[PDB]
């Protein structure tokens, strides 16, 4: 056939793929973490937005660090052969490289490793997107006036 460039990911598989949304609003009193008011608005907005992009959206609320890992592990073990991509949205408290379950922290690397090119073969060569709403430190940006 004609010239083939392959500059863009193949996004015409039967399924666009999964969009896993982990929405942590309420945390165990033991952690001393405060509730994240307004996060439900984010979760709903995301569900509608990705629904319209034809993603299979699955939402989970207030998951412990154990449940987060189990969820990610399970999802990574599914057969993604007929899916074009994978999306995971994390909404929670956090610090650089860490996302908080309702009872403690989870290294982002532990979550993403399940989807490595050599660990999730049905997603090899396919875009794996992680959208993260969480703190990455304690610095504050004072901003600057624009001219």
């Amino acid at each position: 056939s004609g010239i083939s460039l392959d500059n863009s990911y193949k996004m015409d598989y039967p399924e666009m793929g999964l969009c896993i949304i982990i929405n942590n609003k309420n945390f165990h009193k033991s952690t001393g973490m405060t509730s994240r008011s307004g996060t439900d608005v984010d979760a709903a907005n995301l569900r509608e937005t990705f629904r319209n992009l034809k993603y299979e959206v699955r939402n989970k609320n207030d998951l412990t660090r154990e449940e987060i890992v189990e969820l990610m592990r399970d999802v990574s073990k599914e057969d993604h052969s007929k899916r074009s991509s994978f999306v995971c949205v994390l909404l929670s408290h956090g610090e650089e490289g860490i996302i908080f379950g309702t009872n403690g922290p989870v290294d982002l690397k532990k979550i993403t490793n399940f989807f490595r090119g050599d660990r999730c073969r049905s997603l090899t060569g396919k875009p794996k997107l992680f959208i993260i709403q969480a703190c990455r430190g304690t610095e504050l940006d004072c901003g600057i006036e624009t001219d």
Binding site: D6, N7, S8, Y9, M11, D12, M16, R36, S37, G38, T39, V41, D42, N45, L46, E48, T49, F50, N52, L53, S85, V89, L91, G94, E96, T112, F115, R116, G117, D118, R119, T124, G125, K126, P127, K128, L129, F130, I131, I132, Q133, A134, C135, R136, G137, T138, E139, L140, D141, C142, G143
Partner: protein, 103 residues
């Protein structure tokens, strides 16, 4: 030309390739959330996807998100320490191709 590190017989890709992390804020900074309307980042991301997903490549959509968050939002707090602050989302791409949600 020829060398010891190119044109391998067996084609492989980095196990870390094809990942994209769309962070709500810059490394080392707090991330802002409105207790009523949601986070500045997610609000903006959804708005830009709703408006450009069938028109622009993903990185360009996320760039619009960066601008929207950077220009339209500024914190409000009764605590002077956390008042009048800004935020710039952070796109981290290890993708190897352009990404369009449509085809």
């Amino acid at each position: 030309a020829s060398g010891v590190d190119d044109d391998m017989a067996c084609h492989k890709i980095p196990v870390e390739a094809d990942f994209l992390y769309a962070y709500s804020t810059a490394p080392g900074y707090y991330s802002w959330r409105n207790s009523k309307d949601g986070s500045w980042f997610i609000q903006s991301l959804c708005a830009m996807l709703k408006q450009y997903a069938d028109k622009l490549e993903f990185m360009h959509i996320l760039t619009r998100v960066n601008r929207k968050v950077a220009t339209e939002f500024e914190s409000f707090s009764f605590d002077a320490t956390f008042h009048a602050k800004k935020q710039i989302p952070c796109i981290v791409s290890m993708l190897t191709k352009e990404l369009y949600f449509y085809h």
